Design an enzyme around this catalytic site. Structure first.
Site, short mmCIF file in Angstrom:
data_model
loop_
_atom_site.label_atom_id
_atom_site.label_comp_id
_atom_site.label_asym_id
_atom_site.label_seq_id
_atom_site.Cartn_x
_atom_site.Cartn_y
_atom_site.Cartn_z
N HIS A 55 0.83 -1.20 0.00
CA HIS A 55 0.00 0.00 0.00
C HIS A 55 0.87 1.25 0.00
CE1 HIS A 55 -3.57 -2.49 1.76
NE2 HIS A 55 -3.40 -2.69 0.47
N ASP A 195 -1.62 2.40 -8.70
CA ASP A 195 -2.39 1.84 -9.80
C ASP A 195 -3.45 2.81 -10.32
OD1 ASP A 195 -3.44 1.66 -7.33
OD2 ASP A 195 -4.32 -0.33 -7.57
N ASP A 197 -7.19 3.54 -10.89
CA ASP A 197 -8.20 3.16 -9.92
C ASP A 197 -9.60 3.41 -10.48
OD1 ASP A 197 -6.08 2.58 -8.12
OD2 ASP A 197 -6.04 4.67 -7.47
N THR A 252 -13.13 -4.98 -5.75
CA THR A 252 -14.32 -5.40 -5.02
C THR A 252 -15.57 -5.06 -5.84
OG1 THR A 252 -14.09 -3.33 -3.78
CG2 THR A 252 -13.36 -5.36 -2.69
N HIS A 281 -7.34 -1.77 -7.55
CA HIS A 281 -8.11 -1.49 -6.35
C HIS A 281 -8.66 -0.08 -6.49
CE1 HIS A 281 -4.68 0.81 -4.61
NE2 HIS A 281 -5.60 1.35 -3.84
N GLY A 282 -9.87 0.12 -5.97
CA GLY A 282 -10.60 1.30 -6.36
C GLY A 282 -10.34 2.52 -5.50
N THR A 283 -11.41 3.02 -4.88
CA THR A 283 -11.42 4.32 -4.25
C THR A 283 -10.71 4.29 -2.90
OG1 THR A 283 -12.89 6.00 -3.32
CG2 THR A 283 -13.71 3.74 -3.41
#
EC number: 4.6.1.1
Length: 484
Positions: A55, A195, A197, A252, A281-283
């Site tokens: 992360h 990344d 996103d 997700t 991976h998103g928000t």
């Protein structure tokens, strides 16, 4: 609203236009978590977009910003004392959890990035110390605690701290490089930037009929009871699409929505990206450590308009104007709260997050009666809050959406006030229930003053005394609120 995001976005335009074509194609709301330039430069140069392995996100300093560190100052944890070693253990545990993909490799960047970042005004090429068999291309930065050490030919940055000064971490070293981990794409060394996103996916209101194979929509629509009609619509979508499936590669979403994520992946396969899976991976709320509140959310619609919001107040404003408040779809991020209250998965994280600071909770890892009456109560709270967080109600008018939403809040508020009417409640859980209670009260009442019904919340609560159902006691709620 278009170009005002294109000039201050920090993203690349080719991914935006190739998202615009798929927005015209399969009419979904590609909502963005926008990142800065310091990762998408090396993304457009063709280096990998990491999943949920480490992360270490977009740092703002250096030609090797965005790139993942080993010594973790090259991330957001820049100037922290114990967080840098915690991130070093994060990469030492990302090698033991994401093995076969993650290595400890040297870097591979394209060398035009340093000349790209001589003009953003961060790095100053100053003193020279002789090593590695050449006049070494040294450069300092706006900070001098750790520099960068690059030769003009090799793709390795073999950085060092200055031995004439002291470090902030507590350790020293020689000219030891940032060893980076990788998405090793079947043996090809591909290091990791922050990344590309997303924020959300949301189709049109009738493209669920073009997402669900609609022979279940052929048996759902024909039903004589309208409340049970909306419930036959909604319970099918609970048993199909609310149940998110998490991983460590893609993100997700559900089945049809990751089937749309591969088209959001084919948007970059032809235009300058070779790292493969571009949505990873998103928000901020797709992060599984702690949430963040971002102030710039880049909405492109099923028309593809390059719209950016102003701030989070205006973000919730635009959401309640058009994203939910119009004939649209809201598949969302699962004492002055004006428009919103947090979600139910946020409620479950908040529930299991506060019973370790204090040892006692009002219900725990036990086997008694009232604690699991409370567990059935809080399961009913989760179900009522899932059906209050529900934008599947615009098959009827918006008054029906408000009616359904606040009847959910009524049934949840009944049990929330009832479980406080118990034995000795621990004060953390007591004030947490009241902390949610005042805001669920104001969430119903701000809706009601933004409605035209004018009743106080307490009168509406005391006139309704439901036994167990929402099949009969919705008719008395109807006949109270109807005729205006």
């Amino acid at each position: 609203k278009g170009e005002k995001a294109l000039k201050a976005s920090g993203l690349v335009p080719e991914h935006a236009d190739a998202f615009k074509k798929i927005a015209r194609e399969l009419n979904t709301y590609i909502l963005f978590r926008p990142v800065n330039k310091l990762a998408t430069n090396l993304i457009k140069s063709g280096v990998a977009t990491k999943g949920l392995n480490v992360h270490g996100k977009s740092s703002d300093w250096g030609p090797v910003a965005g790139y993942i560190p080993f010594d973790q100052d090259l991330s957001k944890k820049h100037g922290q004392q114990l967080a840098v070693e915690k991130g070093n253990l994060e990469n030492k545990k990302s090698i033991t959890e994401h093995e076969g993909e993650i290595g400890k490799i040297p870097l591979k960047l394209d060398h035009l990035r340093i000349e790209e970042l001589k003009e953003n005004g961060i790095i100053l090429k100053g003193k020279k110390e002789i090593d590695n068999g050449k006049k070494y291309y040294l450069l300092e930065s706006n900070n001098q605690v750790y520099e960068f050490r690059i030769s003009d030919e090799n793709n390795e940055v073999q950085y060092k701290t200055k031995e004439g000064k002291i470090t902030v971490l507590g350790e020293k070293f020689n000219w030891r490089n940032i060893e980076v981990m990788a998405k090793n794409v079947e043996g090809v060394l591909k290091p990791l930037t922050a990344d590309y996103d997303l924020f959300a996916l949301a189709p049109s209101l009738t493209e669920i009929k073009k997402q669900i194979p609609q022979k279940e929509w052929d048996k759902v629509v024909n039903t004589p009871n309208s409340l049970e009609k909306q419930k036959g619509v909604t319970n099918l979508l609970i048993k199909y699409g609310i149940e998110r499936k998490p991983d460590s590669t893609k993100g997700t979403l559900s089945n049809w929505q990751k089937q749309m994520l591969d088209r959001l992946n084919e948007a970059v396969k032809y235009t300058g990206y070779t790292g493969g899976d571009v949505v990873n991976h998103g928000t901020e709320q797709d992060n599984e450590e702690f949430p963040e509140k971002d102030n710039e959310i880049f909405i492109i619609n099923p028309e593809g308009e390059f719209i950016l919001t102003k701030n989070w107040e205006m973000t919730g404003r635009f959401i309640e104007k058009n994203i939910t408040g119009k004939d649209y779809l809201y598949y969302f991020n699962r004492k002055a709260k004006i428009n919103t209250i947090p979600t139910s998965a946020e409620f479950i994280k908040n529930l299991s997050s506060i019973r370790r600071s204090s040892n006692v909770g009002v219900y725990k890892d036990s086997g008694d009666k009232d604690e699991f009456a409370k567990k059935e109560s809080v399961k009913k709270i989760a179900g009522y809050l899932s059906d209050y967080y529900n934008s599947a109600n615009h098959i009827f008018s918006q008054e029906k959406k408000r009616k359904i939403s606040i009847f959910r809040g009524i049934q949840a508020y009944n049990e929330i006030e009832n479980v406080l009417k118990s034995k000795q409640i621990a004060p953390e859980y007591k004030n947490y229930f009241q902390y949610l209670k005042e805001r669920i009260t104001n969430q119903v009442q701000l809706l009601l003053t933004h409605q035209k019904s004018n009743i106080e919340f307490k009168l509406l609560y005391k006139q309704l005394n439901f036994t167990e159902n929402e099949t009969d006691n919705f008719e008395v709620f109807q006949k109270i609120i109807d005729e205006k």
